[PDB]
Amino acid sequence: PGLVPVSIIGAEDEDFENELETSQFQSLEQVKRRPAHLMALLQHVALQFEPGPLLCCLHADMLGSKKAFLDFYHSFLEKTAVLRVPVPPNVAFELDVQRRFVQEVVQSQQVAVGRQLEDFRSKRLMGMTPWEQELAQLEAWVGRDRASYEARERHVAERLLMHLEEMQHTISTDEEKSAAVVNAIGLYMRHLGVRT
Amino acid sequence: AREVKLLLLGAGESGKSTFLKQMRIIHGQDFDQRAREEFRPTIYSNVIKGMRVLVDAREKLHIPWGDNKNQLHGDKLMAFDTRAPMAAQGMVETRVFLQYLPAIRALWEDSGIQNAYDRRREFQLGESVKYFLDNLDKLGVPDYIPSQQDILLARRPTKGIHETHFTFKDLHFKMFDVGGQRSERKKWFECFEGVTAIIFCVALSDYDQVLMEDRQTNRMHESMKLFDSICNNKWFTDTSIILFLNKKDLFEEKIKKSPLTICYPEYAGSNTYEEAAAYIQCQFEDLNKRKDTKEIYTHFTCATDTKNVQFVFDAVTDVIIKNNLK
Ligand SMILES: Nc1nc2c(ncn2[C@@H]2O[C@H](COP(=O)(O)OP(=O)(O)O)[C@@H](O)[C@H]2O)c(=O)[nH]1
Ligand code: ALF
Ligand SMILES: [Mg+2]
């Protein structure tokens, strides 16, 4: 982004020579393609905020080629759904054209998804986000082989997806809300190529 | 029941490691004479490098010498090679230290160099180099042995996680010390499991200093940002969070001369220890989004003072007990 040299020498600057010199999460439309990066975000949210809005967006946009709307309405829009999301007073009453409805649920989750991506970004910089190691190591990768990169992303996602599964006793006191999330995340990851 | 995991946190240079030493001194194996000696080569290394920075500060900040004769003393010091094997490890042998003592004593009494130290708020420098530069006498002796206070005032950047064990008040403490720098925080997450308590340290002395990772961010500003992320972490909803406003001795003497508006453009109060310190404490407790459920146990400490650390830690243990074995 642009670097600058220090004016006066600091006594312990050489102790952090390779630690110095630091837009991957600006929009969901950007990270929704990266499986590994998403698992870093998906963790932060699932753990700190309410997985509703974010998962909803992912399962929603997952549509693009039927029965999906069946399970979708049963996990997010259902008045009694586990991962209930705050929907507009408009469609709440009103419950092909399916297009308008899905689109109308996503837009209401924009402010929430946007506000969590920012929170992640903030933490990112301060170094208060998990998996920064694997995340960074997956960045300094050179190669004339494109398809090979995407290949390792899938394996990384697997490692994280499992690490987030085995140990998930922090999502919420609810012993069931956690099953819904892992499952939801599970399903979407499978849409990218992550083995389960 | 009787298994306690405590995490020492905070931004860089807040005093975390100074605390461990206090713990070791008041609870574990207090520093044997041979143990203290190990701190000698590092103390000589704080002195010589600290000065290197001052002399560079003088020329850079354009501070006229108080004696042009000391310019030849300045060169001798700049000549010192810091990338050499032992010097790289932050160590300096007695044989060589004694080879610079003459230029250091002279450059230290110079008026120009002094004015540089007074303007330290413009460049990275540990204010503990002053305690040694004033004791060049006890350090210039043949076989010098760091005193109990010298060890505590000694500086050494910490990287990675450092675990420590000890028994106090029939409780088995598992105390972990980490590095505060931005690049060092990623390594923190490997310790957010089953935390019984967290002691977040803050340095009151740097509301006028900048970070060393980017010479353009208020240290105190980072401390607040770091505290707002920890204190509100879902991992610590049931964890006792103690806040240590450290370096009260250096602050109490700091407010008098340099103003506090250098950190809080809105502070309309006065430059008093009592009034300013009370202002900062609110700056932090306010970051608490769960003021109803989550409780913050603030304290004003002086990590280098053993007696104070022993008093404050006893009040911290009584809190840990009431919040768990009730
Ligand atoms: N004068 C004074 N020195 C302190 C205080 N707390 C720590 N120190 C010293 O300041 C430096 C920074 O301490 P350190 O523990 O290394 O900070 P850490 O990086 O957070 O571990 C060391 O030189 C310590 O001797 C304090 O309250 N007053
Ligand atoms: F500056 Al540190 F431990 F945070 F040495
Ligand atoms: Mg330390």
Side-chain angles (χ1 to χ4, degrees):
Chain A
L3 310 189
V4 184
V6 196
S7 308
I8 309 183
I9 284 75
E12 314 151 62
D13 274 327
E14 309 192 315
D15 295 54
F16 297 83
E17 285 181 300
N18 310 100
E19 329 286 326
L20 307 166
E21 303 175 57
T22 332
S23 296
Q24 188 74 194
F25 299 89
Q26 286 305 316
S27 50
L28 191 67
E29 199 87 310
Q30 184 205 311
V31 68
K32 82 175 180 72
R33 224 154 311 211
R34 303 307 80 192
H37 292 301
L38 198 72
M39 277 305 302
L41 175 64
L42 248 304
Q43 171 179 167
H44 193 74
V45 182
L47 221 298
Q48 310 293 302
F49 313 94
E50 288 298 71
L54 183 60
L55 290 173
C56 178
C57 274
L58 291 179
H59 276 194
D61 187 272
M62 173 177 61
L63 284 58
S65 54
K66 290 191 179 68
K67 181 179 67 71
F69 190 74
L70 166 75
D71 323 300
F72 178 62
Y73 175 83
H74 225 297
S75 309
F76 296 119
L77 305 174
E78 179 176 60
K79 186 264 183 180
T80 60
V82 186
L83 308 173
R84 170 196 250 295
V85 300
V87 299
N90 175 66
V91 189
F93 164 72
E94 303 164 59
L95 279 157
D96 180 52
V97 188
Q98 171 195 297
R99 282 276 148 290
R100 182 182 313 158
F101 271 40
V102 179
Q103 177 195 310
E104 203 67 4
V105 177
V106 175
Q107 301 317 299
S108 185
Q109 314 318 301
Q110 296 304 67
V111 178
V113 174
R115 251 308 222 62
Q116 294 167 181
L117 275 175
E118 182 273 350
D119 186 276
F120 185 46
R121 264 176 273 169
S122 301
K123 299 303 153 203
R124 187 86 172 300
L125 298 187
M126 283 195 293
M128 295 304 293
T129 59
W131 305 157
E132 268 183 303
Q133 183 75 279
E134 300 78 68
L135 230 53
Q137 188 171 301
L138 192 64
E139 280 172 44
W141 187 88
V142 195
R144 189 190 299 135
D145 194 356
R146 157 62 189 178
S148 183
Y149 173 71
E150 309 187 66
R152 221 168 77 276
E153 283 194 302
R154 307 189 283 91
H155 303 302
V156 185
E158 284 183 51
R159 279 175 59 71
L160 304 181
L161 172 53
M162 296 182 273
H163 198 317
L164 194 153
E165 205 164 311
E166 310 176 12
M167 285 183 251
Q168 46 64 65
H169 338 295
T170 319
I171 298 181
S172 188
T173 175
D174 191 349
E175 311 165 60
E176 232 313 285
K177 190 163 63 189
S178 59
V181 183
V182 181
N183 270 307
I185 296 172
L187 171 55
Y188 184 56
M189 287 293 92
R190 274 190 282 286
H191 181 280
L192 294 169
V194 181
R195 309 171 182 67
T196 296
Chain B
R2 289 162 167 171
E3 294 283 306
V4 178
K5 189 181 185 166
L6 187 157
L7 284 183
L8 281 184
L9 303 179
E13 292 223 310
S14 44
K16 305 186 283 295
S17 264
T18 297
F19 280 91
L20 284 213
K21 303 189 190 174
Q22 287 302 358
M23 293 301 98
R24 172 186 187 158
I25 291 166
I26 64 176
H27 296 147
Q29 184 219 86
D30 182 300
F31 294 107
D32 31 286
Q33 13 275 179
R34 36 221 163 299
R36 298 200 304 290
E37 289 186 56
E38 315 177 59
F39 286 79
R40 171 203 299 166
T42 139
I43 284 157
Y44 290 166
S45 173
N46 284 350
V47 182
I48 183 174
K49 293 203 180 62
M51 191 47 93
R52 287 247 307 164
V53 180
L54 250 47
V55 309
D56 197 64
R58 203 218 78 275
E59 204 233 358
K60 250 69 172 185
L61 284 185
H62 304 296
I63 302 303
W65 292 83
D67 197 329
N68 301 316
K69 181 188 69 63
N70 296 321
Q71 243 287 167
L72 199 63
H73 283 306
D75 299 314
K76 161 81 83 65
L77 267 170
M78 293 307 308
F80 184 72
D81 193 301
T82 174
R83 296 209 73 100
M86 217 65 186
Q89 295 186 80
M91 295 180 202
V92 175
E93 216 166 60
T94 300
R95 196 264 312 302
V96 35
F97 178 72
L98 257 38
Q99 289 267 308
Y100 286 75
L101 198 60
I104 291 160
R105 293 180 158 194
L107 290 163
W108 187 225
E109 236 44 57
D110 195 71
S111 85
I113 255 56
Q114 216 100 62
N115 281 194
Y117 177 78
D118 286 320
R119 283 181 56 191
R120 56 187 174 289
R121 81 145 179 60
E122 275 173 288
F123 59 90
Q124 315 306 305
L125 179 90
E127 65 301 303
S128 203
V129 308
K130 182 198 182 310
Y131 166 76
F132 289 121
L133 286 171
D134 282 317
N135 279 290
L136 251 36
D137 274 351
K138 40 166 299 183
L139 265 76
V141 295
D143 271 308
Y144 155 64
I145 297 179
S147 65
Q148 184 224 51
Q149 270 279 50
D150 285 32
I151 273 77
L152 292 163
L153 281 146
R155 168 68 183 178
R156 168 159 287 255
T158 296
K159 286 178 161 194
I161 310 157
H162 292 41
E163 186 183 45
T164 319
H165 300 182
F166 64 90
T167 297
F168 167 52
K169 292 190 167 188
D170 279 6
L171 278 182
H172 310 306
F173 282 93
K174 296 285 173 290
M175 198 178 261
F176 294 68
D177 174 48
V178 313
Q181 280 87 27
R182 265 173 184 160
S183 57
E184 262 289 312
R185 291 166 201 153
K186 58 187 85 308
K187 306 174 180 178
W188 282 14
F189 287 78
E190 289 78 0
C191 306
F192 288 26
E193 68 249 296
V195 184
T196 299
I198 290 184
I199 296 181
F200 190 87
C201 308
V202 185
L204 295 169
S205 309
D206 50 29
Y207 50 88
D208 72 333
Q209 303 181 54
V210 289
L211 293 177
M212 77 113 89
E213 25 269 65
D214 66 277
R215 311 286 230 263
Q216 17 147 28
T217 287
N218 191 304
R219 311 200 109 193
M220 179 76 89
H221 275 32
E222 250 290 79
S223 218
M224 287 175 72
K225 281 142 64 184
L226 189 65
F227 184 55
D228 187 73
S229 184
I230 285 172
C231 174
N232 288 357
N233 209 320
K234 288 290 205 155
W235 287 91
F236 317 124
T237 29
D238 283 295
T239 303
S240 320
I241 297 172
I242 307 129
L243 179 104
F244 274 7
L245 299 181
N246 196 39
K247 298 223 185 59
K248 77 169 217 55
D249 54 310
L250 294 182
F251 170 84
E252 207 158 3
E253 182 175 57
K254 186 72 136 291
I255 24 81
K256 282 177 177 295
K257 57 184 296 70
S258 195
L260 168 58
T261 71
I262 319 178
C263 183
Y264 303 114
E266 59 299 315
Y267 181 65
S270 50
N271 296 298
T272 308
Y273 167 72
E274 200 54 44
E275 191 171 327
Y279 182 74
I280 298 173
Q281 182 188 311
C282 230
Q283 295 308 306
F284 281 103
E285 301 197 64
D286 207 55
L287 298 161
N288 201 333
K289 292 180 173 58
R290 255 67 195 301
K291 307 178 84 296
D292 309 298
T293 317
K294 185 97 282 176
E295 177 160 296
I296 289 175
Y297 306 91
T298 301
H299 268 290
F300 284 79
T301 44
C302 180
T304 57
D305 186 300
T306 302
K307 311 172 171 179
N308 172 221
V309 178
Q310 179 161 193
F311 176 73
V312 181
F313 188 68
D314 213 305
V316 169
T317 302
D318 286 327
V319 172
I320 299 177
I321 287 171
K322 301 159 96 169
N323 291 25
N324 279 289
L325 315 322
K326 204 283 188 180

